[PDB]
Amino acid sequence: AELTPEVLTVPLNSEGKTITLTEKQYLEGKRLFQYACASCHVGGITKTNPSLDLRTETLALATPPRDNIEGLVDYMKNPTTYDGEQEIAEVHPSLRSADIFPKMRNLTEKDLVAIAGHILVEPKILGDKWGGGKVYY
């Protein structure tokens, strides 16, 4: 089995447009997710709020939908609750709260896309283990 262009092809937007990520981008997405996100989202769960995971099906039912690059990139600039109703930058790392989450300070637009690409690619590799928690270890 291989990490093919097909595995690396994910939804770019809500309208069904895709983007094929490169292997460099895949590497970069893992690296940067570990850098900025994994302390809470290791393996696609959320340690400080286990009801919300990073599974693609969960992301699709978020508002606005987060099951695509655009929705994930926007989440990283201006995160909201799952219903889209409150802006939670003050308690969740984002570009807009890089003052209080200093690890966000040097993330570029390119980096956000790489991290979003990791979130969509990993469950295509790991299936239910992604967002599964200890049951699936």
Query: Tokens 């989202």 belong to which residue?
Result: 41
Residue 43 φ/ψ region, left for φ over 0, alpha for ψ in the -120 to 50 degree band, beta for the rest = left
List 15, 24, 83, 135, residue binding another protein (CB under 8 A): 135
The answer to the question of residue 27 lying near another protein (CB under 8 A) is no
Q: How far apart are CA 83 and CA 61, in angstroms?
A: 9
Question: Contact between 23 and another protein (CB under 8 A)?
Answer: no
The answer on whether 110 is annotated among ligand-binding residues is no
Residue 131 as a binder of another protein (CB under 8 A): the answer is no
What residues have CB less than 8 Å from 63, skipping those under 6 apart?
80, 82, 83, 84
Give me the least distance between CB of 82 and another protein, in Å please.
Answer: 12
Among 90, 108, 109, 110, binds another protein (CB under 8 A): 90
